Amino acid sequence: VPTLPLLLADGAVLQRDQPMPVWGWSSPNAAIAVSFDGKRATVKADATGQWKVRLPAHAAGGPYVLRVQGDGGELQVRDVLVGDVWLAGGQSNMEWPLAQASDGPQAVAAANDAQLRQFKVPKSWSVQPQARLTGGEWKAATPANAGEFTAVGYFFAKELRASTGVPIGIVNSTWGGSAIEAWMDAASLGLNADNKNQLPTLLYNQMIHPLQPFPVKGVIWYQGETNATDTGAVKYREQFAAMIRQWRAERGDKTLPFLWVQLANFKAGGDKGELSPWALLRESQSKTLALPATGQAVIIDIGNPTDIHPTNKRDVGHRLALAARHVAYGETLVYSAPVFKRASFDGGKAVLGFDLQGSALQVRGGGAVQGFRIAGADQRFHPATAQIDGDRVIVRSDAVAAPVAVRYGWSENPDDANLINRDALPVSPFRTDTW
């Protein structure tokens, strides 16, 4: 009488268009048969009692029944869809449930999609990497269930349902207040294999590692507030890149799409002088775009100055889905605002070159450009004026005759910064210096 992992249960969404692993346990050397939509595979478990087959790549569809057959009896897994599965991780703002979004009641009331599903990994930890989850089931996006979906993940999935027309499943693996070190395996930290959600490897071991044989289309991520500190904001860029590369290596896919949300604006109290840990962390996030198959949603226009938990999650999901459509689905569209590329300082002016990313630079509210500061060699930054000229912005200040650096939206709460494109996507904060 065989058993299956918690992910291969009633209502599951399985990753389409790549090999389909089915694994589980039984008696040692037990004979096992697995069938799915008229395909059958047999295998013998090993002396541990573990068994695994790979079923052919299957196109989007469903519902189907996954049958597993041993000599003791049969397991039937019902209402299985085949589509795209996305892993959704991070801390509070990915955990944030749909019911508590700005549109929560109305969005839950509109959530009537049997082909959009979530698997909520329970908050759990372990000092060692684990082969099994300790809980969780698949729920479809009905009004009875959708209130508990990740708000950002639901809205992201709702966008993909419309652009792909295939089933979407979200594996929700989140924990409010967590540090990235808790989500990283021992190796990415240089380690051997208090609040536990801030301790190295403890969440990865129980909430990520067991998921890794389950194929996914890509990952969406919203984390970093906890690491936006004097000590961890810059080194986050190396930790985050290492985390992505390791998750990817574990899954055997060095270009597995990995998308994240840059921190929103928040009066975090960390800014002092020209030091801004939150702006340093956002930079660490933007630098990670150097890795292949990555994208970033910028959201400094929709944070809450006075609450680290902004309730506008619909627009977060919209911008992650733009990026997913480019990075994971190979589509051409405006998925990013213009990106700063190059700076030249001649005269009393700085000219900044942007990659326009398929759009045009404009200004929220239509007035003068806000959010720029400029510094001389003394490294003191003054407010500056800025003018748009196609793919360039020219920046200057009456009080800086020999500028050497420019900073745009470089603070924890850059709620004035107003450079956008014609689709109203905001330009990411940035700086020209490495001070």
Residues that bind Zn ion (CB under 5 A): 5-6, 129, 132-133, 307, 309, 318, 391, 416
- Cβ at position 62, least distance to Zn ion in Å: 21
CB-wise, 114 or 351, nearer to Zn ion?
Answer: 351
- Cβ at position 85, least distance to Zn ion in Å: 16
- Cβ at position 289, least distance to Zn ion in Å: 10
CA-to-CA dists, residue 357 to 302, 326, 332, 336, angstroms: 21, 12, 10, 6
- Cβ at position 119, least distance to Zn ion in Å: 11
DSSP SS3 for 42 = strand
Examine residue 338 and say whether the peptide bond preceding it is cis (omega within 30 degrees of 0): no
CA-to-CA dists, residue 52 to 24, 49, 171, 205, 251, angstroms: 7, 10, 21, 21, 16
CB-wise, 151 or 376, nearer to Zn ion?
Answer: 151
CB-wise, 166 or 376, nearer to Zn ion?
Answer: 166
- Cβ at position 158, least distance to Zn ion in Å: 8
CB-wise, 6 or 114, nearer to Zn ion?
Answer: 6
CB-wise, 5 or 61, nearer to Zn ion?
Answer: 5
Which amino acid does the sequence have at 84?
D
The upper half-sphere exposure of residue 163, i.e. CA atoms within 13 Å in the direction of its Cβ, equals 20
- Cβ at position 295, least distance to Zn ion in Å: 8
What does the alpha-carbon distance between residue 127 and residue 144 come to, in Å, rounded to a whole number? 35
Secondary structure tally for the chain: helices H, strands E: 8, 23
CB-wise, 205 or 227, nearer to Zn ion?
Answer: 205
Q: Is the dihedral of CA 303, 309, 311, 312 positive or negative?
A: positive
CB-wise, 379 or 387, nearer to Zn ion?
Answer: 387
Tell me the sheet residues that pair with 421: 361
User: DSSP string covering 277-313, please?
Assistant: HHHHHHHHHHHGGGSTTEEEE--TTS-BTTBSS-S--
- Cβ at position 322, least distance to Zn ion in Å: 8
Contact assessment for residue 186 and residue 199, using Cβ atoms and an 8 Å cutoff: no
